[PDB]
Write a protein that binds this ligand. Structure first.
Ligand SMILES: NC(=O)C1=CN([C@@H]2O[C@H](COP(=O)(O)OP(=O)(O)OC[C@H]3O[C@@H](n4cnc5c(N)ncnc54)[C@H](OP(=O)(O)O)[C@@H]3O)[C@@H](O)[C@H]2O)C=CC1
Ligand SMILES: NC(=O)C1=CN([C@@H]2O[C@H](COP(=O)(O)OP(=O)(O)OC[C@H]3O[C@@H](n4cnc5c(N)ncnc54)[C@H](OP(=O)(O)O)[C@@H]3O)[C@@H](O)[C@H]2O)C=CC1
Lengths: 324, 323
């Protein structure tokens, strides 16, 4: 009576071993580092009891139907959940596992890394070395934007947004602002952060860091209108989802001098075509969605995803279940 | 009128200070490019005051060029290893430099570099532009975290302290440091342990060098340093080029003896574009941009000018170097 499990990719070893040991399961896997096409996904999920997927696998009505009534648990190796058809998943009584907390510190780290390479202009500095542009120490050359006495606006002061604030505080940040559905005064206290409106966040911040979820509410949030309320000297950082940022409005505002610079960990689509105008701008840094990328973290998420699925398979509590 | 030579275009505020001085005759190297030693010797002849950069070589020949008039040298920098201090002392010439005003900015850059290096941002940046990016991937571009790490700081001075303070909320579990002498009061903020240099290499997951360049720091970071470091560790230098044995570093990185290196300084500066370290994907090199924010740089310009003026008029200087 072996439950079928499908894994949509080669995952870190700790998660792969935990599945392999599950003697009540047979594990079928997409043996590749490359994304599984949708029709190969539809083929592999057929009659699966459990699905172990990733943030870039689109788990829509099409693949839930391809799977049929066997499917009881979908374990995603990510904290983001927007790639999942939650309404349809709910309707069918299927359990969801995801990976919060476990990747928080690492992602916060990556966000501050990105904010700092962008704000201190490291990539064009690097290139001035390689291309022969460097001729000496120069007093007014490659001057960037410093965090001392600065105001930091965070859109979405969740666990990752809190961990980012905590990492920027010792940099001499004067004032923390934040935006969202409701205040979090218990959370914000640590930073003496102020709850403000989006327009006030834009007008007042030297640094804007977006660390919210993708919802209907957050889709297209940072558009022309937003970059226009921003300071000309401000730096814009997005580590959330690509669809939060209008990329045409971003390019324009970067190209026209409406903001100083931006660093993106996330894009629309992913990958961004090497062709994209964003990639031609020297005041734009784009990273390939590496927020949670250290082995230890990815090992930890992989094991968490495994254990979510196995418990979900056995009718047990999950280490980290997403409810309803 | 006291004669002044300025070896470069300095940021406005400081240049303004010098243009508003009625007691002074100011000559500038009117350029963003460094002064030939030959032009510097001509430039400084007769000068009472020299306002100079960390990259000008103020040796015997330039002091002798300048002559007995020379009363103040004011450098737009904190480092002083480009001044022949022994000769300056004995000639009784006063020195100005720029401590403190650049401490926060430089620490900021050093953590910038450590993070760009250890989270592999360059490699990442180019996987994007060169079409290597194909999806999100669980085992790809994984770097080295600060959580539960050991950071060794070589030189827990002003900047080394501002560095550790910025590193602490990243979850560092342990700070070690070394130097000539412990600094117990300053060490305490980080609970840092003073250890030898071999022990600091052996234990540290991340190594930051924020020391001054002296005869005893010179070539400190060499083959045997790199040999005792963890094969997983990351090496950052923001001090001076000459603290590092560059060949040993190249050798170490190319053979996997350490994980990677971020450098804000090299030997010589600029590093030639075909140099061996520029062929390694695990080596990040920045063009000595530690103090590069406009606001820090103007404050430096203004300091360097006021230190000069004050010396020229026999007054106490905002920041004099004690010789
Ligand atoms: N770059 C990377 O590799 C990674 C990226 N991420 C992304 O970042 C997100 C971080 O989530 P995490 O902190 O773990 O969990 P959280 O749910 O706590 O973070 C989401 C935040 O978004 C806020 N938010 C929701 N709607 C809005 C809105 N309309 N305007 C402003 N803020 C809003 C929420 O606050 P409120 O409800 O009060 O509005 C909350 O603070 C993930 O959902 C994921 O998409 C996560 C991990 C790694
Ligand atoms: N990349 C850049 O733009 C910048 C580079 N610099 C460089 O950084 C240096 C530090 O400046 P700052 O902190 O303001 O000056 P400090 O005078 O405070 O010097 C810092 C440290 O050098 C240390 N030192 C001397 N010898 C050794 C050694 N044997 N081993 C370990 N440490 C040693 C001192 O420690 P101890 O006496 O106990 O040995 C002190 O901790 C400057 O001298 C300059 O060369 C500075 C600013 C910007």
């Amino acid at each position: 009576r072996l439950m079928k499990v499908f894994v949509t990719r080669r995952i870190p070893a700790e998660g792969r071993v935990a599945l392999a040991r599950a003697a009540d399961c047979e594990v079928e896997q997409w043996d590749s580092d490359e994304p599984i096409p949708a029709k190969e996904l539809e083929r592999g999920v057929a009659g699966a009891h459990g699905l172990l997927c990733l943030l870039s696998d689109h788990v829509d009505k099409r693949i839930l139907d391809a799977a049929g009534a066997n499917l009881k648990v979908i374990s995603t190796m990510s904290v983001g959940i927007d790639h999942l058809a939650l309404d349809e998943i709910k309707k069918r009584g299927i359990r969801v596992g995801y990976t919060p907390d476990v990747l928080t510190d690492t992602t916060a780290e990556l966000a501050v890394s990105l904010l700092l390479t962008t704000c201190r202009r490291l990539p064009e500095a690097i290139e001035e070395v390689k291309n022969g542009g460097w001729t000496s120490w120069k007093p007014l050359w490659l001057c960037g934007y410093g965090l001392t006495q600065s105001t930091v606006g965070i859109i979405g002061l969740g666990r990752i947004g809190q961990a980012i604030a905590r990492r920027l505080k010792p940099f001499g940040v004067q004032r923390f602002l934040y935006t969202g559905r409701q205040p979090r005064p218990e959370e914000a206290a640590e930073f003496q952060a102020e709850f403000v409106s989006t327009p006030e966040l834009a007008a007042q911040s030297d640094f804007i860091v977006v660390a919210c979820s993708l919802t209907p509410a957050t889709e297209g949030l940072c558009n022309k209108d937003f970059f226009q309320k921003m300071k000309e000297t401000a730096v814009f950082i997005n580590i959330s989802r690509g669809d939060v940022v209008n990329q045409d409005d971003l390019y324009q505002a970067l190209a026209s001098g409406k903001i100083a610079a931006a660093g993106l960990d996330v894009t629309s689509p992913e990958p961004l075509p090497t062709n994209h105008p964003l990639l031609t701008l020297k005041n734009c840094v784009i990273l390939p969605h590496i927020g949670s990328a250290t082995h230890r973290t990815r090992n930890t998420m992989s094991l968490l995803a495994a254990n979510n699925l196995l418990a979900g398979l056995r009718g047990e509590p999950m280490p980290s279940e997403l409810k309803l």
